[PDB]
Design a protein around this ligand. Structure first.
Ligand SMILES: O=C1C(Br)=CC(=C(c2cc(Br)c(O)c(Br)c2)c2ccccc2S(=O)(=O)O)C=C1Br
Ligand SMILES: O=C1C(Br)=CC(=C(c2cc(Br)c(O)c(Br)c2)c2ccccc2S(=O)(=O)O)C=C1Br
Ligand code: NA
Length: 129
């Protein structure tokens, strides 16, 4: 499923992502735009041999199990396949685990380079929320 910008914002808010850990909703929409262009089925290999999955391009070295990444931790306790569903629940729950501690949304390079330090509230312009 390729979500619309506001469509995704609304689905995220139905899972309480708005202001999760202090990150306003636009941060997550901005991250999803530049990670996956809003496509839940996006998959992309990395130079370390891990792969990123789903609308937030969550990695298989640390977060999900894809059965082919040496030394994977699966800290979200989920098959990476689950992050490709049209239902964003699994991606949201894993994103919440990622942001629960550590470097927060800095786990996403795209967030750090494209979203951090900008007015991310622009990303929910014109969205009924
Ligand atoms: O900085 C990088 C970046 Br950027 C990409 C890549 C590669 C690559 C190729 C494909 Br195809 C692919 O799907 C992905 Br992901 C990466 C690559 C290129 C030539 C030979 C072997 C690889 S290898 O590393 O894949 O063996 C290597 C370095 Br170094
Ligand atoms: O030195 C190389 C060079 Br150059 C290319 C490639 C690859 C590759 C090659 C072709 Br051709 C291609 O069409 C695609 Br896509 C990827 C490759 C890259 C990453 C992962 C798997 C492959 S794999 O496909 O080789 O398993 C690996 C090495 Br090592
Ligand atoms: Na894995």
């Amino acid at each position: 499923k390729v979500f619309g910008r506001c469509e995704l914002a609304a689905a995220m808010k139905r899972h309480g992502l708005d202001n999760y850990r202090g990150y306003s909703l636009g941060n997550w929409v901005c991250a999803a735009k530049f990670e996956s262009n809003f496509n839940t089925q996006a998959t992309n290999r990395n130079t370390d041999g891990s792969t990123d999955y789903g609308i937030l391009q969550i990695n298989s070295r640390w977060w999900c199990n894809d059965g082919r990444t040496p030394g994977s931790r699966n800290l979200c306790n989920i098959p990476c396949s689950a992050l490709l569903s049209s239902d964003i629940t699994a991606s949201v729950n894993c994103a919440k685990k990622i942001v629960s501690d550590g470097n927060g949304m800095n786990a996403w390079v795209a967030w750090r380079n494209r979203c951090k330090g900008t007015d991310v509230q622009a990303w929910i312009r014109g969205c009924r929320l």
